[PDB]
Design an enzyme around this catalytic site. Structure first.
Site, short mmCIF file in Angstrom:
data_model
loop_
_atom_site.label_atom_id
_atom_site.label_comp_id
_atom_site.label_asym_id
_atom_site.label_seq_id
_atom_site.Cartn_x
_atom_site.Cartn_y
_atom_site.Cartn_z
N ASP A 1 40.56 36.62 38.92
CA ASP A 1 40.93 37.98 39.76
C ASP A 1 40.75 39.37 38.73
O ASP A 1 41.49 39.98 39.19
CB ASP A 1 41.53 37.39 40.75
CG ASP A 1 41.34 38.26 41.92
OD1 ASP A 1 39.89 38.77 41.87
OD2 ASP A 1 42.28 38.43 43.13
N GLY B 1 45.90 46.05 51.26
CA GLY B 1 45.10 47.13 51.18
C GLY B 1 45.99 47.80 49.70
O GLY B 1 44.71 48.54 49.28
N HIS C 1 37.97 40.42 43.72
CA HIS C 1 37.52 40.55 44.93
C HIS C 1 36.99 41.28 45.72
O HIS C 1 36.89 41.84 47.03
CB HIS C 1 39.02 39.22 44.98
CG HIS C 1 40.47 40.01 45.95
ND1 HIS C 1 40.81 39.83 45.49
CD2 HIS C 1 40.58 40.80 47.28
CE1 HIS C 1 42.33 40.16 46.05
NE2 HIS C 1 41.93 40.52 46.85
N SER D 1 45.73 45.66 47.47
CA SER D 1 44.34 44.35 46.19
C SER D 1 43.97 45.29 45.07
O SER D 1 43.73 46.25 45.25
CB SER D 1 43.13 43.44 46.88
OG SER D 1 44.30 42.40 48.35
N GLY D 2 43.89 45.04 43.75
CA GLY D 2 43.55 45.33 42.77
C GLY D 2 44.46 46.47 41.77
O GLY D 2 44.43 46.83 40.50
N1 LIG Z 1 51.20 39.19 50.61
C1 LIG Z 1 50.59 39.63 49.52
N2 LIG Z 1 50.85 39.75 48.14
C2 LIG Z 1 48.89 40.12 49.89
C3 LIG Z 1 48.57 41.60 48.34
C4 LIG Z 1 47.44 41.85 48.38
C5 LIG Z 1 46.49 41.65 49.75
N3 LIG Z 1 45.37 41.32 49.90
C6 LIG Z 1 44.63 40.88 51.11
C7 LIG Z 1 42.99 40.63 51.19
C8 LIG Z 1 43.37 40.52 52.54
C9 LIG Z 1 40.76 40.30 53.09
C10 LIG Z 1 40.89 40.91 52.63
C11 LIG Z 1 41.52 41.31 50.82
C12 LIG Z 1 42.77 41.79 49.80
O1 LIG Z 1 42.61 42.19 49.47
N4 LIG Z 1 46.10 40.29 51.42
C13 LIG Z 1 47.03 40.70 50.44
C14 LIG Z 1 48.35 40.24 50.04
MG LIG Z 2 46.85 48.88 44.95
#
Ligand SMILES: NC(=[NH2+])c1ccc2[nH]c(-c3ccccc3O)nc2c1
Ligand SMILES: [Mg+2]
Ligand SMILES: [Ca+2]
Length: 223
Positions: free
Chosen positions: A84, A175, A40, A177-178
């Site tokens: 993902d 922020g 994503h 993610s990945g």
């Molecule tokens: N609560 C969590 N563990 C989490 C982790 C990564 C995320 N990444 C995002 C996210 C939201 C909108 C667009 C891209 C994203 O990676 N929400 C997230 C929530």
């Molecule tokens: Mg990271």
């Protein structure tokens, strides 16, 4: 990362920042030419920044390399976020050193209860917005699949696992993610999704890397 701490400059040497004019996702270096991140986080025009600590300051230990190609998992579903995971090849091989190193892929899946290290430059507030410029770390255990599935009914597949604290307070966030989830020296997860950040009974969900080792190995050897 909410409720975590400052890792320290270059203490997570396999952590990468994906930048498209700004930081938008994390990633993990698995060898000199490849990075694994979340599907994503796919974008066209990605520059991988290695050896970063503060992302707004060139401190001298960085390597900025453009991606030559991105490969999203063949069965990635953007609606459920199942599968993902994506691979990014660097146009040039990175120079590995103490500040830039690769992380090993797992030989087996880790057990519930195993403690892991999650890192990233994402939001640090559960209710609010504060984006740090230095890398944050969080030690969190893998939770039982039963606690993960009870939190997200009908949404967890065999390619996902939850890590965190049901009480709330500590979690990865937007922020992040990945980015990597390293347990016992192996890359076992990729920050994928969650419900808000650090909320009670809403742990984070990670892509289960042990289910994709054959696909990763096969794909990088053919590209
Ligand atoms: N609560 C969590 N563990 C989490 C982790 C990564 C995320 N990444 C995002 C996210 C939201 C909108 C667009 C891209 C994203 O990676 N929400 C997230 C929530
Ligand atoms: Mg990271
Ligand atoms: Ca920097």
């Amino acid at each position: 990362i909410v409720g975590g701490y400052t890792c320290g400059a270059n203490t997570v040497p396999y952590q990468v920042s994906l930048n498209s004019g700004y930081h938008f996702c994390g990633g993990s270096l698995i060898n000199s030419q490849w990075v694994v991140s979340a599907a994503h986080c796919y974008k066209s025009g990605i520059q991988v920044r290695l050896g970063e600590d503060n992302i707004n300051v060139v401190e001298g230990n960085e390597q900025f390399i453009s991606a030559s190609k991105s490969i999203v998992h063949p069965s990635y579903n953007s609606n459920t976020l199942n599968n993902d995971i994506m691979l990014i090849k660097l146009k040039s091989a990175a120079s590995l050193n103490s500040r830039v190193a690769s992380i090993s892929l797992p030989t087996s899946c880790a057990s519930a209860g195993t403690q892991c290290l999650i890192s990233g430059w994402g939001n640090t507030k559960s209710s609010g917005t504060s984006y740090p410029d230095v890398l944050k770390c969080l030690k969190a255990p893998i939770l039982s699949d039963s606690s993960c599935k009870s939190a997200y009914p009908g949404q967890i597949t065999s390619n996902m696992f939850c890590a965190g604290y049901l009480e709330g307070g500590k979690d990865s966030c937007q922020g992040d993610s990945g980015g990597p989830v390293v347990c016992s020296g192996k890359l076992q997860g990729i920050v994928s999704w969650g419900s808000g950040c650090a909320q009670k009974n809403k742990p984070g969900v990670y892509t289960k890397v042990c289910n994709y080792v054959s696909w990763i190995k096969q794909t990088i050897a053919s590209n």
